[PDB]
Enzyme design. Sequence first.
Site, mmCIF file in Angstrom:
data_model
loop_
_atom_site.group_PDB
_atom_site.id
_atom_site.type_symbol
_atom_site.label_atom_id
_atom_site.label_comp_id
_atom_site.label_asym_id
_atom_site.label_seq_id
_atom_site.Cartn_x
_atom_site.Cartn_y
_atom_site.Cartn_z
ATOM 1 N N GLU A 142 196.146 29.412 -1.054
ATOM 2 C CA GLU A 142 195.391 28.168 -1.053
ATOM 3 C C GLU A 142 195.259 27.590 0.353
ATOM 4 O O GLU A 142 194.221 27.004 0.673
ATOM 5 C CB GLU A 142 196.036 27.160 -2.001
ATOM 6 C CG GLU A 142 195.189 25.928 -2.253
ATOM 7 C CD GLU A 142 194.081 26.152 -3.287
ATOM 8 O OE1 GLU A 142 192.980 25.581 -3.102
ATOM 9 O OE2 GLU A 142 194.310 26.876 -4.286
ATOM 10 N N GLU A 146 191.431 27.130 2.226
ATOM 11 C CA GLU A 146 190.983 25.784 2.538
ATOM 12 C C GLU A 146 190.836 25.514 4.033
ATOM 13 O O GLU A 146 190.290 24.469 4.401
ATOM 14 C CB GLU A 146 191.947 24.755 1.934
ATOM 15 C CG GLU A 146 191.475 24.157 0.605
ATOM 16 C CD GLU A 146 192.424 23.104 0.016
ATOM 17 O OE1 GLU A 146 192.721 22.107 0.706
ATOM 18 O OE2 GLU A 146 192.867 23.270 -1.148
ATOM 19 N N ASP A 168 201.906 7.762 -12.704
ATOM 20 C CA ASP A 168 201.428 6.348 -12.625
ATOM 21 C C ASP A 168 200.443 6.081 -13.758
ATOM 22 O O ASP A 168 200.310 4.910 -14.157
ATOM 23 C CB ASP A 168 200.783 5.966 -11.289
ATOM 24 C CG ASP A 168 201.071 4.528 -10.889
ATOM 25 O OD1 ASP A 168 202.171 4.052 -11.190
ATOM 26 O OD2 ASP A 168 200.197 3.901 -10.272
#
Lengths: 243, 243
Positions: A142, A146, A168
Amino acid sequence: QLKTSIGLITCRMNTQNNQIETILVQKRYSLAFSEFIHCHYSINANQGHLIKMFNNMTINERLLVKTLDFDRMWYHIWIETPVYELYHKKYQKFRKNWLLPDNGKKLISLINQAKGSGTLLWEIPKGKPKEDESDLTCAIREFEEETGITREYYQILPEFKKSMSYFDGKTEYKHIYFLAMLCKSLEEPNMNLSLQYENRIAEISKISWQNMEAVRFISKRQSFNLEPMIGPAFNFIKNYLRY
Amino acid sequence: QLKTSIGLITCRMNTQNNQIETILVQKRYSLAFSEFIHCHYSINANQGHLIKMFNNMTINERLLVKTLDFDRMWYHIWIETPVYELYHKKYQKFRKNWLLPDNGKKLISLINQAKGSGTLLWEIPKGKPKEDESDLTCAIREFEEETGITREYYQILPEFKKSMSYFDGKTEYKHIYFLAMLCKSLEEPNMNLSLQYENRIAEISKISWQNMEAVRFISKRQSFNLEPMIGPAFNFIKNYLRY
């Protein structure tokens, strides 16, 4: 459930100062925009979200929504990758919410009444592991999907591994981070962004070295706080560089 | 010649700290993009510019250029304001450069080979004076054309006036700045940005209070350095607030 992403923190010493920097990336578009054209909202429940979604887009994004050419909105996230079924699902869910009933006029109105503007996130490059991969292999893969930054530029520091967990909202997102030290010098990583590598740009608008003050500065200004991962990253770097 | 812009530096004290902040604005699009769809380049001279122009656009902008739907590129800057002649001039100059000869293929190729990404500028709100205006009237008018912040929120401090002049290219651009102190509290100025006021958003993507460290941080990261105007602005604020 357990959503889990794995990333890599790549650091260097920019010799000009005695300062450790790390690679952060910026997103091209907002979550709010992406939630909108993928229809992560209802028109019968949660008004307060519908309002927040529009407010938390960038002005350009809203201007795209004001177009009503859903295909133009789709292009912003997908850039011509072929997902027709995905496209046509979302298009028809888009058509039935503000084209059939009010012919845009409620959507366009909601766009106009939308106030302020969103902020595009700075993040440590992270991703989702393929089925047959080790954590570290996901992180490596990854990281250079990227940024174009290949394996020969950094050395993995094996005895670092940090893991944040968030709820959250809610479910649980586990974010796991390895650590790498640069070796072959790389003065300008934002130069690896180019429309020919359509997967580095699918989601990234900038790659950039950031020292600590930049890390703190960005964190005061985005929901995603990233000192808890760079703090220990840099500390570990310092203790490593001594010996 | 003499290009002259006049702006206003509006400050406040955010009581949480003992810190002076000022209003800065961010541009929605890059100069490089704007130079491209207004044809401020030649295809027979200055290759090195043609390459810099494309590199200094944002990734989204390049993605717009990769579309070849010049109308879509036009919309990004103009947002449906009616300039047909302007449009059709630029469209035909656009058509003859990469549509007639190579059918996009050189342009599209040049887009793909474009590396890195541009940065959208933070600026003090400034503008060009109308024919029958005083400097200060231009500064006032332009300041709230660009931020929605009306006259009753600030007091002009009359005995401040700073003037930068640039010729890095070249001609001469004179930038003149007055100074205002806030009085009615205004905690969230980025909230005045909204697609219904199409002239605040025509060019602005964010309005924001910035203390000095933010000013310096942004200036390390954009060609336009703005400490030479906020430095004296804030100093003058401090000496004013004492008495």
